[PDB]
Amino acid sequence: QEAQQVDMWKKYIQWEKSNPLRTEDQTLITKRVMFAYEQCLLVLGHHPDIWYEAAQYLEQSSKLLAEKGDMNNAKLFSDEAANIYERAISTLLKKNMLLYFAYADYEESRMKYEKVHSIYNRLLAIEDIDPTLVYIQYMKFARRAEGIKSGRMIFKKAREDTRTRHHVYVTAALMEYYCSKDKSVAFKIFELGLKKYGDIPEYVLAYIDYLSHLNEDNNTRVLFERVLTSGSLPPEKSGEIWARFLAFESNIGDLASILKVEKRRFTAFKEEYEGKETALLVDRYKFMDLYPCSASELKALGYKD
Amino acid sequence: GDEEEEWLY
């Protein structure tokens, strides 16, 4: 089938890369290898890995020619690798996020930032695409190559795009905490995001995770109470939150606070946890891969996860 | 607008 054809082609390409003729001219080995790549891409151009590996090979060759001092062939093969990326996203895979990103990173590594901005915006201009990850990668590039202020602009652009999902908020907040070491901005971003996506369990869990690891008991408990009592998180979508709360109390609280939280949780899920009190108790004691029960005991208890 | 961005940073 198609997987067999792909493997055959990659083995032919690897053979050519092994320089069976023992030529000493790297330009000739590269011409032969790229020829094999071209024949392959003629019929397997819908496989993104082949474009990527071909571009990577051309870049590697360019570097090897630069080390030997042949700057002209180095520049030639560098530009031709760029064109490999361009052809890959221009036909067949016009919507492949992975190759757009690879292209962006290649042009970033050549210090051609204008071309990077064009690539990310070309991708963003395709209407029927989820741009969230696109904005995340674009913010990463902006921050690390142009600075905090360029990153904040990309984040602004992401919020104004009605297709964007909550992850960019998470990313921006974490970026401010990890790169700028600024907890106040991190907080404000998480809070704006909470106003907009407080009914999404994965978002709320991200904020909870960030704050918990700040290691301030009162702030953590306050956030737990805010999210679980007020807020928009469906009560039937809150199980993981309660679990994190029980683990927080098990780490910093006493048996009384743990039992209070356990009982509030059970109330919230009185129906779903009928007769499952012992299976829940298991999670009062488990740590990492240590359980208080054997696998057979756990199955007989109705234990899940 | 510039108000949300001012509040954030």
Author numbering:
A (entry chain A): 244 to 548
B (entry chain C): 19 to 27
Quoted from the paper:
In mammals, the cleavage and polyadenylation specificity factor (CPSF) constitutes the core of the 3′ end processing machinery onto which the remaining factors, including cleavage stimulation factor (CstF) and poly(A) polymerase (PAP), assemble. These interactions are mediated by Fip1, a CPSF subunit characterized by high degree of intrinsic disorder. Here, we report two crystal structures revealing the interactions of human Fip1 (hFip1) with CPSF30 and CstF77. Taken together, these results provide a structural basis for the multivalent scaffolding and regulatory functions of hFip1 in 3′ end processing.
To shed light on the hFip1–CstF77 interaction, we subsequently reconstituted a complex comprising the hFip11–35 fragment with a truncated construct of the CstF77 HAT domain (residues 241–549) and determined its X-ray crystallographic structure at a resolution of 2.7 Å. The structure reveals that hFip1 binds to a conserved positively charged patch located on the convex surface of the CstF77 HAT domain arch. Within the hFip11–35 fragment, only the evolutionarily conserved residues 20–27 were ordered, adopting an alpha-helical conformation. Interaction of hFip11–35 with CstF77 involves salt-bridge contacts of Glu22hFip1 and Glu23hFip1 with Arg402CstF77, and hydrophobic contacts involving Leu26hFip1 and Tyr27hFip1 with Phe398CstF77, Val428CstF77, Ile432CstF77, and Leu435CstF77. Additionally, the Tyr27hFip1 side chain interacts with Arg395CstF77 via π–π stacking. Corroborating these structural observations, simultaneous substitutions of Glu22hFip1 and Glu23hFip1, or Trp25hFip1, Leu26hFip1 and Tyr27hFip1 with alanine disrupted the hFip11–35–CstF7721–549 interaction in a pull-down experiment, whereas alanine substitution of Trp25hFip1 alone did not have an effect. In turn, mutation of the positively charged interaction surface in CstF77 (Arg395, Arg402, and Lys431 mutated to alanines) abolished the interaction with hFip11–35. Our crystal structure of the hFip1–CstF77 subcomplex reveals that a hFip1 binds via conserved motif within the N-terminal ‘acidic’ region to the convex arch of the CstF77 HAT domain on both protomers in the CstF77 homodimer, resulting in a 2:2 stoichiometry. By reanalysis of previously reported cryo-EM data, we reveal that this interaction mode is preserved in the context of the mPSF–CstF complex. In the presence of excess CstF77, PAP binding was considerably reduced, indicating that CstF77 competes with PAP for binding to hFip1.
